[PDB]
Design an enzyme around this catalytic site. Structure first.
Site, PDB file in Angstrom:
ATOM      1  N   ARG A   9       0.470  -0.591   0.001  1.00  0.00           N
ATOM      2  CA  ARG A   9       0.128   0.076   0.044  1.00  0.00           C
ATOM      3  C   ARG A   9       0.854   1.252   0.150  1.00  0.00           C
ATOM      4  O   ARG A   9       1.981   1.217   0.768  1.00  0.00           O
ATOM      5  CB  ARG A   9      -0.900  -0.348   1.217  1.00  0.00           C
ATOM      6  CG  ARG A   9      -2.169  -1.239   1.454  1.00  0.00           C
ATOM      7  CD  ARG A   9      -2.643  -1.190   2.536  1.00  0.00           C
ATOM      8  NE  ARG A   9      -2.942   0.326   2.446  1.00  0.00           N
ATOM      9  CZ  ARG A   9      -2.964   0.884   3.747  1.00  0.00           C
ATOM     10  NH1 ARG A   9      -2.195   1.173   4.590  1.00  0.00           N
ATOM     11  NH2 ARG A   9      -3.763   2.237   3.929  1.00  0.00           N
ATOM     12  N   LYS A  64      -3.264  -8.295  10.564  1.00  0.00           N
ATOM     13  CA  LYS A  64      -4.513  -8.262  10.829  1.00  0.00           C
ATOM     14  C   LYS A  64      -5.593  -7.722  10.030  1.00  0.00           C
ATOM     15  O   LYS A  64      -6.808  -7.856   9.914  1.00  0.00           O
ATOM     16  CB  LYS A  64      -4.649  -7.381  12.544  1.00  0.00           C
ATOM     17  CG  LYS A  64      -4.203  -6.060  11.769  1.00  0.00           C
ATOM     18  CD  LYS A  64      -5.116  -4.923  13.533  1.00  0.00           C
ATOM     19  CE  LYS A  64      -4.480  -3.454  13.020  1.00  0.00           C
ATOM     20  NZ  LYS A  64      -5.133  -2.856  13.789  1.00  0.00           N
ATOM     21  N   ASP A  65      -4.827  -7.569   9.164  1.00  0.00           N
ATOM     22  CA  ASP A  65      -5.740  -7.034   7.632  1.00  0.00           C
ATOM     23  C   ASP A  65      -5.824  -8.171   6.793  1.00  0.00           C
ATOM     24  O   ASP A  65      -6.048  -8.343   5.917  1.00  0.00           O
ATOM     25  CB  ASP A  65      -4.604  -5.589   6.970  1.00  0.00           C
ATOM     26  CG  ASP A  65      -4.911  -4.686   7.625  1.00  0.00           C
ATOM     27  OD1 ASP A  65      -5.564  -4.466   8.323  1.00  0.00           O
ATOM     28  OD2 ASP A  65      -3.845  -3.963   7.811  1.00  0.00           O
ATOM     29  N   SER A 110     -13.953  -0.292  14.810  1.00  0.00           N
ATOM     30  CA  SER A 110     -13.183  -1.069  15.338  1.00  0.00           C
ATOM     31  C   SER A 110     -14.173  -1.748  16.068  1.00  0.00           C
ATOM     32  O   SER A 110     -14.102  -0.753  17.299  1.00  0.00           O
ATOM     33  CB  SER A 110     -11.987  -1.370  15.911  1.00  0.00           C
ATOM     34  OG  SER A 110     -12.032  -2.749  16.582  1.00  0.00           O
ATOM     35  N   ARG A 113     -12.607  -3.252  19.548  1.00  0.00           N
ATOM     36  CA  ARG A 113     -12.373  -1.956  20.602  1.00  0.00           C
ATOM     37  C   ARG A 113     -13.592  -1.457  20.647  1.00  0.00           C
ATOM     38  O   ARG A 113     -13.254  -0.885  21.716  1.00  0.00           O
ATOM     39  CB  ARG A 113     -11.954  -1.134  20.198  1.00  0.00           C
ATOM     40  CG  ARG A 113      -9.750  -1.405  19.186  1.00  0.00           C
ATOM     41  CD  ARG A 113      -9.801  -0.464  18.608  1.00  0.00           C
ATOM     42  NE  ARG A 113      -8.232  -0.963  18.297  1.00  0.00           N
ATOM     43  CZ  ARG A 113      -7.233  -0.441  17.138  1.00  0.00           C
ATOM     44  NH1 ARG A 113      -7.992   0.366  16.727  1.00  0.00           N
ATOM     45  NH2 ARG A 113      -5.932  -0.310  17.242  1.00  0.00           N
ATOM     46  N   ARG A 130     -11.880   6.656  10.754  1.00  0.00           N
ATOM     47  CA  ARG A 130     -11.405   5.972   9.545  1.00  0.00           C
ATOM     48  C   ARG A 130      -9.881   7.101   9.045  1.00  0.00           C
ATOM     49  O   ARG A 130      -9.960   7.941   9.564  1.00  0.00           O
ATOM     50  CB  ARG A 130     -11.870   6.092   8.759  1.00  0.00           C
ATOM     51  CG  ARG A 130     -12.661   4.011   8.104  1.00  0.00           C
ATOM     52  CD  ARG A 130     -13.544   4.080   7.916  1.00  0.00           C
ATOM     53  NE  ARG A 130     -15.116   4.512   8.676  1.00  0.00           N
ATOM     54  CZ  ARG A 130     -15.427   4.216   9.078  1.00  0.00           C
ATOM     55  NH1 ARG A 130     -15.655   3.051  10.004  1.00  0.00           N
ATOM     56  NH2 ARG A 130     -16.908   4.456   9.283  1.00  0.00           N
ATOM     57  N   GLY A 131      -8.849   6.529   8.673  1.00  0.00           N
ATOM     58  CA  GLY A 131      -7.776   6.773   8.105  1.00  0.00           C
ATOM     59  C   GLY A 131      -6.371   6.085   7.603  1.00  0.00           C
ATOM     60  O   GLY A 131      -6.353   5.752   8.984  1.00  0.00           O
ATOM     61  N   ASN A 132      -5.439   6.942   7.459  1.00  0.00           N
ATOM     62  CA  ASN A 132      -4.124   7.109   8.275  1.00  0.00           C
ATOM     63  C   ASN A 132      -3.680   7.629   9.608  1.00  0.00           C
ATOM     64  O   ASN A 132      -4.518   7.970   9.700  1.00  0.00           O
ATOM     65  CB  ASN A 132      -2.838   7.352   6.721  1.00  0.00           C
ATOM     66  CG  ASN A 132      -3.220   6.517   5.505  1.00  0.00           C
ATOM     67  OD1 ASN A 132      -3.799   5.531   5.093  1.00  0.00           O
ATOM     68  ND2 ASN A 132      -2.709   7.139   4.770  1.00  0.00           N
ATOM     69  N   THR A 135      -3.494  11.130   9.801  1.00  0.00           N
ATOM     70  CA  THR A 135      -5.087  11.826   9.507  1.00  0.00           C
ATOM     71  C   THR A 135      -5.617  11.482  10.951  1.00  0.00           C
ATOM     72  O   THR A 135      -6.408  12.782  10.797  1.00  0.00           O
ATOM     73  CB  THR A 135      -5.624  11.160   8.530  1.00  0.00           C
ATOM     74  OG1 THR A 135      -5.143  11.421   6.912  1.00  0.00           O
ATOM     75  CG2 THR A 135      -6.860  12.282   8.020  1.00  0.00           C
ATOM     76  N   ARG A 136      -4.958  10.262  11.295  1.00  0.00           N
ATOM     77  CA  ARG A 136      -6.887  10.442  12.485  1.00  0.00           C
ATOM     78  C   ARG A 136      -5.495  10.949  13.362  1.00  0.00           C
ATOM     79  O   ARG A 136      -6.646  12.136  14.551  1.00  0.00           O
ATOM     80  CB  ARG A 136      -6.394   8.539  12.900  1.00  0.00           C
ATOM     81  CG  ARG A 136      -7.329   7.620  11.986  1.00  0.00           C
ATOM     82  CD  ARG A 136      -6.818   5.964  12.549  1.00  0.00           C
ATOM     83  NE  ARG A 136      -7.855   5.471  11.691  1.00  0.00           N
ATOM     84  CZ  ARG A 136      -7.924   4.895  12.565  1.00  0.00           C
ATOM     85  NH1 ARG A 136      -9.068   3.958  13.463  1.00  0.00           N
ATOM     86  NH2 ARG A 136      -8.976   3.427  11.417  1.00  0.00           N
TER      87      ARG A 136
HETATM   88  C1  DPM Z   1      -8.306  -4.908  10.988  1.00  0.00           C
HETATM   89  C2  DPM Z   1      -8.299  -3.952  10.990  1.00  0.00           C
HETATM   90  N1  DPM Z   1      -7.079  -2.946  10.238  1.00  0.00           N
HETATM   91  C3  DPM Z   1      -7.539  -1.579  11.168  1.00  0.00           C
HETATM   92  C4  DPM Z   1      -6.114  -0.414  10.222  1.00  0.00           C
HETATM   93  C5  DPM Z   1      -4.468  -1.057  10.862  1.00  0.00           C
HETATM   94  N2  DPM Z   1      -4.720  -1.554  10.119  1.00  0.00           N
HETATM   95  C6  DPM Z   1      -3.074  -1.579  10.709  1.00  0.00           C
HETATM   96  C7  DPM Z   1      -2.458  -0.899  11.323  1.00  0.00           C
HETATM   97  C8  DPM Z   1      -1.500  -0.782  12.695  1.00  0.00           C
HETATM   98  C9  DPM Z   1      -1.561  -1.524  13.375  1.00  0.00           C
HETATM   99  C10 DPM Z   1      -0.931  -3.064  13.134  1.00  0.00           C
HETATM  100  O1  DPM Z   1       0.386  -2.711  11.582  1.00  0.00           O
HETATM  101  O2  DPM Z   1      -1.035  -3.631  13.395  1.00  0.00           O
HETATM  102  C11 DPM Z   1      -4.171  -0.884  12.281  1.00  0.00           C
HETATM  103  C12 DPM Z   1      -4.817   0.866  12.675  1.00  0.00           C
HETATM  104  C13 DPM Z   1      -4.230   0.693  13.945  1.00  0.00           C
HETATM  105  O3  DPM Z   1      -5.453  -0.286  14.512  1.00  0.00           O
HETATM  106  O4  DPM Z   1      -3.499   1.669  14.440  1.00  0.00           O
HETATM  107  C14 DPM Z   1      -8.710  -2.039  12.115  1.00  0.00           C
HETATM  108  C15 DPM Z   1      -8.391  -0.736  12.920  1.00  0.00           C
HETATM  109  C16 DPM Z   1      -9.429   0.304  12.649  1.00  0.00           C
HETATM  110  C17 DPM Z   1      -9.849   1.654  13.492  1.00  0.00           C
HETATM  111  O5  DPM Z   1      -9.530   1.401  14.772  1.00  0.00           O
HETATM  112  O6  DPM Z   1     -10.651   2.686  13.203  1.00  0.00           O
HETATM  113  C18 DPM Z   1      -9.250  -3.308  12.017  1.00  0.00           C
HETATM  114  C19 DPM Z   1      -9.717  -2.597  12.840  1.00  0.00           C
HETATM  115  C20 DPM Z   1      -9.525  -3.999  14.382  1.00  0.00           C
HETATM  116  O7  DPM Z   1      -8.416  -3.533  15.214  1.00  0.00           O
HETATM  117  O8  DPM Z   1     -10.201  -4.853  15.327  1.00  0.00           O
END
Ligand code: DPM
Length: 294
Positions: A9, A64-65, A110, A113, A130-132, A135-136
């Site tokens: 990405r 987690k993605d 999430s 959470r 939402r966002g990187n 931005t959050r």
């Molecule tokens: C599955 C899910 N992805 C995200 C977005 C996300 N992906 C990777 C990261 C960094 C942490 C890592 O790599 O382990 C992140 C952002 C983060 O958690 O800081 C989310 C977050 C959605 C949100 O909080 O709005 C989720 C959902 C989840 O974690 O349950």
């Protein structure tokens, strides 16, 4: 070939992980030429298309993605050393969750959470965010949220560790599957690439995430699901905890499992079925719009 193309990405964080893998590859193979092929679930489908049409060799994701199902020919082959898997409490005005007065707006999209947040504090307002990461943090600073929940691993890797007001223990906010770990996907029949990736795999972390993913797989989960799945290696055994909750925190189903490392997958499946047979199925059916785990 001596060229290894990494699809990823284009966010600051994604590019950080790309560099992380590249560095590890270069250190294990000083002669490899690593090229980055960045490109704009939807956050994995494009990278997979790149893999299937040979525009890339491997794809780097945050565990987690990574989805639970893969198109034939693709798969997860490497799981790197896990970072801090905990969620972090970020805020500018307050120092902890307990310190947040009633009516405070916490940002996160999430469901995992949120359900946990709402279970302990029904008085807080959980608002989507939402966002990187950048931005959050911006929206938090602009005053749109009193606090937000982000992963410790993301802030640390971005050098924004000072943002972490407090790292929330797993018992308070059970981590998402594979949170804190980086995983590499590639074509299963690509022996050369797989051989090059062998040096990046971290056994213990692979043990933990395997138990976590097996649990999630059975529940047919992803990011948009209120599921927690976290494993630790405690005295030679894997301790797996999992939870499925209603987004409002009224009903949270919890379970745990402990066993030998070689049973990581079956432990995951067993625990998942236990949750399913105890109501998780009805809750998940809501979130999935009729669909529910087998
Ligand atoms: C599955 C899910 N992805 C995200 C977005 C996300 N992906 C990777 C990261 C960094 C942490 C890592 O790599 O382990 C992140 C952002 C983060 O958690 O800081 C989310 C977050 C959605 C949100 O909080 O709005 C989720 C959902 C989840 O974690 O349950």
């Amino acid at each position: 070939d001596n060229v290894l193309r990494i699809a990823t990405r284009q966010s600051p964080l994604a590019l950080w992980q790309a560099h992380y893998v590249k560095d590890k590859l270069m250190a294990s193979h000083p002669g490899l030429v690593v090229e980055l092929v960045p490109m704009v679930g939807l956050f994995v489908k494009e990278l997979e298309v790149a893999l299937l049409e040979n525009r890339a060799d491997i794809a780097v994701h945050s565990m987690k993605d990574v989805p639970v199902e893969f198109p034939q020919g693709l798969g997860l082959v490497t799981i790197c050393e896990r970072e801090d898997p905990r969620d972090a409490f970020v805020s500018n005005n307050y120092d902890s969750l307990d310190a947040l007065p009633a009516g405070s707006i916490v940002g996160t999209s999430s469901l995992r959470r949120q359900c946990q947040l709402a279970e302990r504090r029904p008085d807080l307002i959980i608002r989507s965010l939402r966002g990187n990461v950048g931005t959050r943090l911006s929206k938090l600073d602009n005053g749109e949220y009193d606090a937000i929940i982000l992963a410790v691993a993301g802030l640390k890797r971005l050098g924004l560790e000072s943002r972490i007001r407090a790292a929330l223990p797993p018992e308070i906010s059970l981590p998402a599957v594979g949170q804190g770990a980086v995983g590499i996907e590639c074509r299963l029949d690509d022996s050369r690439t797989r051989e090059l990736l062998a040096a990046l795999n971290h056994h213990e972390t692979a043990l933990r995430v395997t138990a976590e993913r097996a649990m999630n797989t059975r529940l047919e989960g992803g990011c948009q699901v209120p599921i927690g799945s976290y494993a630790e290696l405690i005295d030679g055994e894997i301790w797996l905890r999992a939870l499925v909750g209603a987004p409002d925190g009224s009903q949270i189903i919890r379970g745990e499992r402990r066993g030998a490392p070689q049973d990581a997958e079956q432990m995951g499946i067993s625990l998942a079925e236990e949750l399913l047979n105890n109501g998780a199925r009805e809750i998940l059916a809501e979130v999935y719009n009729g669909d529910a785990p087998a």
